[PDB]
Amino acid sequence: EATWVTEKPLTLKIHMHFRDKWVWDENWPVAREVARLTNVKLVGVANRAATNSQEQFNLMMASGQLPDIVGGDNLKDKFIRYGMEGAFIPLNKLIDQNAPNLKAFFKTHPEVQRAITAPDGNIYYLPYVPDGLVSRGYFIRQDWLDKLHLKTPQTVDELYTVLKAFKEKDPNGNGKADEIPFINRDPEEVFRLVNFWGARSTGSNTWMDFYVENGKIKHPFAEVAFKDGIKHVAQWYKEGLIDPEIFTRKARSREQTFGNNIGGMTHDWFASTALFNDALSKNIPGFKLVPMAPPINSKGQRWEEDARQIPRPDGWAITATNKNPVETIKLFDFYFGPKGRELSNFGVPGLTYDIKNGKPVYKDTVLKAAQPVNNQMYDIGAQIPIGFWQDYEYERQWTNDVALQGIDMYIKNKYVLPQFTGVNLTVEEREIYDKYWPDVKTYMFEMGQSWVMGTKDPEKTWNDYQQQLKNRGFYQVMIVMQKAYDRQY
Ligand SMILES: O=C(O)[C@H]1O[C@@H](O[C@H]2[C@H](O)[C@H](O)[C@H](O)O[C@H]2C(=O)O)[C@@H](O)[C@@H](O)[C@@H]1O
Numbered sequence: 060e061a062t063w064v065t066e067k068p069l070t071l072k073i074h075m076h077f078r079d080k081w082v083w084d085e086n087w088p089v090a091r092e093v094a095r096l097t098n099v100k101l102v103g104v105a106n107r108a109a110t111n112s113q114e115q116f117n118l119m120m121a122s123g124q125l126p127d128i129v130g131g132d133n134l135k136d137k138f139i140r141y142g143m144e145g146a147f148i149p150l151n152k153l154i155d156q157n158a159p160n161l162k163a164f165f166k167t168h169p170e171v172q173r174a175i176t177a178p179d180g181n182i183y184y185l186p187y188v189p190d191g192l193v194s195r196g197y198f199i200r201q202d203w204l205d206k207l208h209l210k211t212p213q214t215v216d217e218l219y220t221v222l223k224a225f226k227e228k229d230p231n232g233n234g235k236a237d238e239i240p241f242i243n244r245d246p247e248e249v250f251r252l253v254n255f256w257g258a259r260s261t262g263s264n265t266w267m268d269f270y271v272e273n274g275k276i277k278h279p280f281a282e283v284a285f286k287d288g289i290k291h292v293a294q295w296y297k298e299g300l301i302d303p304e305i306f307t308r309k310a311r312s313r314e315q316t317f318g319n320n321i322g323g324m325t326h327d328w329f330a331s332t333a334l335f336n337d338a339l340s341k342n343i344p345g346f347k348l349v350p351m352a353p354p355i356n357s358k359g360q361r362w363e364e365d366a367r368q369i370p371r372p373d374g375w376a377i378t379a380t381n382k383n384p385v386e387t388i389k390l391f392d393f394y395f396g397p398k399g400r401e402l403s404n405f406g407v408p409g410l411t412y413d414i415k416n417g418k419p420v421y422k423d424t425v426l427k428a429a430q431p432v433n434n435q436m437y438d439i440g441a442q443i444p445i446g447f448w449q450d451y452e453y454e455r456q457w458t459n460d461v462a463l464q465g466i467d468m469y470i471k472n473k474y475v476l477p478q479f480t481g482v483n484l485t486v487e488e489r490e491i492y493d494k495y496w497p498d499v500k501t502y503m504f505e506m507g508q509s510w511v512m513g514t515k516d517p518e519k520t521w522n523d524y525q526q527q528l529k530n531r532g533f534y535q536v537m538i539v540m541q542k543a544y545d546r547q548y
């Protein structure tokens with residue numbers, strides 16, 4: 060082939076554990092097709108039985124026996140830290156000399172290059188580059204609203220009334236108090252409910268990210284607004300308005316709850332969430348899960364805190380043990396060219412899509428499957444958090460009119476908050492970040508869960524919590540973040 064990266068066939072080892080559920084599979088249709096076109100085959104070495112992606116990275120790193128490539132989600136920080144320590148190689152020269160598609164991408168997307176550049180000026184990974192503007196929105200059961208003679212809730216107080224009616228007034232009509240008013244695939248979304256009481260949960264699509272307010276770097280979990288907001292979330296959890304299993308249910312939450320007519324509301328991505336209307340129309344007559352404007356919060360605003368993050372802190376890196384870095388960067392580059400981008404987005408031609416009227420078009424068997432197309436793509440090795448360039452066209456093809464109405468409502472009415480795009484730490488500032496932040500973040504999540512579940516009272520533990528943050532070096536992290544912000548802006 061002319062797309063061939065190397066003349067002699069090459070096999071590389073990739074450690075890629077992602078989203079706590081998936082590993083790289085060389086038997087994937089997409090992986091097979093990429094191997095054929097590039098003459099480079101990636102063989103997975105990650106533990107498929109394991110269910111903690113970050114831990115698997117840690118074990119691999121601690122063992123000292125590195126593969127050739129490491130990929131996965133939420134590895135940006137680890138790519139940078141172990142890049143500077145020499146476990147991953149800088150890609151700057153390799154890109155410049157061997158990677159025209161990446162060069163042309165970075166030229167036209169300077170902001171992405173900046174986002175993946177380490178404090179030493181080196182690029183240690185290639186990112187998952189999403190395509191699109193909005194991500195998540197609120198969805199509510201319109202059929203339940205109508206059946207209970209309720210108007211769409213406009214404020215937090217009105218929402219409380221609605222969710223209470225969902226819980227107590229038997230909208231599925233089976234005589235049981237089985238309804239769960241608010242559900243979510245993502246446990247972290249329970250924290251986002253503090254938005255209703257004028258508190259942030261994250262600055263970006265990255266969970267528990269910092270934000271900027273009036274020239275000051277802040278972290279959502281350290282703010283007194285969070286203390287007051289999480290108190291309310293705890294109350295709603297105690298009242299059973301929030302899924303008792305919100306921390307545990309996870310991936311198939313929508314299929315379980317909406318699919319069995321017990322879920323009333325969620326906060327999730329427009330396309331896949333709205334697809335549930337098509338999937339459940341026969342099973343649950345009248346089922347209508349519609350986008351809802353965010354309620355007016357206690358600060359008098361309608362917040363959509365989440366948006367697409369370009370790029371994501373996801374991707375892959377070349378190890379120092381890799382004896383074929385030139386061949387590897389050319390493989391990496393393939394994904395940003397026309398054929399590579401097509402495959403990594405749409406799957407395999409003849410299997411999952413066809414070129415029709417000069418464009419990749421999903422087969423009817425894919426579009427009418429009543430299973431979200433992104434899920435379908437994962438199964439065959441597409442839409443995975445490698446270094447690749449998402450093409451929104453893939454998503455447009457399975458975004459229905461209900462999803463479109465929601466997307467357009469959110470764009471036009473300006474609900475989406477300005478996103479935190481990070482600060483440029485020096486190497487010295489980064490040392491403090493890498494040292495303290497991971498353990499602080501873990502502590503924050505665990506305290507957050509405790510407050511929500513009612514095992515700890517936020518009001519009674521706040522002062523000791525703050526002291527613990529100090530002891531764990533959180534405010535040392537805040538100092539370097541603010542210093543970096545002051546330099547950059
Ligand atoms: O579900 C959708 O409509 C969109 O999902 C996006 O994926 C994100 C989602 O949280 C997934 O469950 C997984 O965690 O990956 C997330 C991500 O890639 O940021 C995209 O697949 C988007 O194209 C879908 O339309």
Ligand SMILES: [Ca+2]
Nearest residue numbers: 229233235237
């Ligand atoms: Ca019921």
